[PDB]
Design a protein around this ligand. Structure first.
Ligand SMILES: N#Cc1ccc(OCCCN2CCC([C@@](O)(c3ccccc3)C3CCCC3)CC2)cc1
Length: 466
């Protein structure tokens, strides 16, 4: 409408008033996505984009939120004539979904930086005619709800978004773009992507949201950044309380990334009486294991990041090894570049810098160093093993000589007497390698003096020398 009951909480004068609105909406049949996204975008705008005049919290008046809401619903209802797309069965058709997609897409400014902060909400759509990639998918779902299309829902992989709809929720449709320089496939299914076993489509173990998970997504999408080195305390606190509200009601049960985002917020500013960040990261991993066949990479990356920030080197190495153990059962495809970048940065910047400090500290006389622990060496090896296995059978390679230099350097941070204590066992501290690259390397991993050239040859499969 809005409906009279959704209006009684206004004006919203504080973070806790916003939380009350979310709690009210979540206690309804169908939480109103359009309402909730407009409200979050309004409060983010005036807490992060333009704080001129700010004295405590940007008061969200009904009259303002209602006009924005009428702007959206009028644009959608005026442009989508439902009479042209009859619904057999309380479910939508592909043509109708495509039409809603076209409507949102065609409303967007023709040229803008698609990567800016704060263009994720319906507030940005209405006031700036700008949305980021997943923001367009969310807007399509909001628009569908506003039209009464109960069956259309958000689907999320770790780096892309689209919709599901139709008989039993079984149809997929692309509704937004992915990446840059990939021709879009808007209107099509995601079955080619699932079938090629790319990371982008998670071998089909992607999230299929209900309305409550869609609210969780908009909460994760809050962006507290004011600039490069400055976050809004107000938005961090709002995001955190909203995530706890969603947690308590059970709606983060099937959402690993949201649990990782909540753990990150708790690391930054812990809520008394709540679970530790670690407990939360592990719940993230448990959710991925329970609902998505343990096919998600970020639950382990979140955990590794925490361990890396706190210099638990052994635990960070184990969590990164576990990331590699997930990626190994994917094919590296065109459009998976975001995950290559994450692995590249870990291998080639983060781990070398961690091990460099570990080596200084060891010279200083640290006891129980990761560099003296052959289980740490084993995690390092398992990490490279899964990246090598990932590459096997993929339609493009992963490894090149730029990776070999870092490999050699990281191996050399462990003394030969530490490296020799890892037992590498065949199928069909002990480690088994899955990749042919690392199996051929086993001989080289123990020498007192690492044979650098030979390692390079083995990792890149370079056939010849100068
Ligand atoms: N070591 C280490 C490490 C590395 C990366 C890392 O990344 C955590 C952030 C993961 N990132 C996933 C994509 C995600 C997102 O960009 C996204 C998620 C799902 C589909 C599309 C986009 C947003 C979710 C809310 C709005 C979009 C933002 C969070 C953490 C630790």
């Amino acid at each position: 409408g809005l409906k009279a009951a959704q209006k009684t909480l206004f004006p919203l004068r504080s973070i806790d008033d916003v939380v009350r609105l979310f709690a009210a909406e979540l206690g309804r049949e169908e939480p109103d996505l359009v309402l909730l996204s407009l409200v979050l975008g309004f409060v983010e705008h005036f807490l992060a984009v333009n704080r001129v005049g700010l004295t405590y919290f940007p008061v969200a008046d009904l009259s303002i939120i209602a006009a924005l809401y009428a702007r959206f619903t009028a644009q959608i209802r005026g442009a989508v004539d439902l009479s042209l797309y009859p619904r057999e069965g309380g479910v939508s058709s592909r043509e109708l979904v495509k039409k809603v997609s076209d409507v949102i897409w065609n409303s967007l400014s023709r040229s803008y930086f698609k990567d800016r902060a704060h263009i994720q909400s319906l507030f940005s759509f209405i006031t700036g005619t700008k949305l980021d990639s997943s923001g367009v998918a969310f807007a399509v779902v909001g628009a569908c709800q506003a039209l009464g299309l109960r069956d259309v829902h958000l689907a999320l992989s770790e780096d892309h978004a689209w919709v599901v709809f139709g008989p039993n929720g079984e149809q997929t449709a692309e509704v937004t773009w992915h990446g840059k320089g990939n021709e879009d496939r808007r209107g099509q299914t995601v079955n080619a992507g699932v079938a090629e076993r790319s990371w982008l489509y998670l071998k089909g173990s992607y999230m299929r949201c209900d309305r409550k998970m869609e609210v969780a997504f908009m909460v994760c999408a809050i962006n507290p950044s004011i600039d490069l080195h400055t976050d809004s305390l107000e938005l961090l606190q709002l995001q955190q309380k909203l995530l706890w509200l969603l947690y308590d009601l059970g709606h983060l049960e099937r959402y690993p990334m949201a649990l990782g985002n909540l753990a990150d917020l708790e690391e930054l500013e812990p809520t008394p009486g709540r679970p530790d960040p670690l407990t939360l990261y592990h719940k993230g991993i448990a959710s991925a294991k329970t609902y998505y066949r343990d096919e998600h990479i970020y639950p382990y990356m979140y955990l590794a990041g925490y361990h890396c920030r706190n210099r638990n080197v052994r635990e960070a190495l184990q969590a990164w090894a576990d990331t590699a153990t997930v990626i190994q059962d994917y094919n590296y495809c065109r459009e998976d570049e975001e995950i290559y970048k994450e692995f590249f940065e870990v291998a080639n910047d983060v781990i070398p810098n961690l091990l460099k400090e570990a080596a200084s500290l060891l010279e200083a006389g640290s006891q129980g160093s990761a560099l003296q622990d052959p289980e740490c060496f084993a995690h390092l090896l398992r990490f490279y093993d899964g990246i090598c296995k990932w590459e096997e059978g993929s339609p493009t390679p992963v490894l090149h000589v730029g990776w070999a230099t870092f490999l050699v350097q990281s191996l050399g941070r462990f003394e030969g007497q530490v490296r020799q204590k890892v037992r590498i066992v065949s199928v069909p501290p002990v480690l088994t390698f899955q990749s042919e690259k690392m199996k051929g390397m086993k001989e080289l991993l123990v020498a007192t003096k690492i044979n650098s050239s030979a390692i390079k040859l083995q990792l890149t499969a370079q056939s010849q020398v100068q």
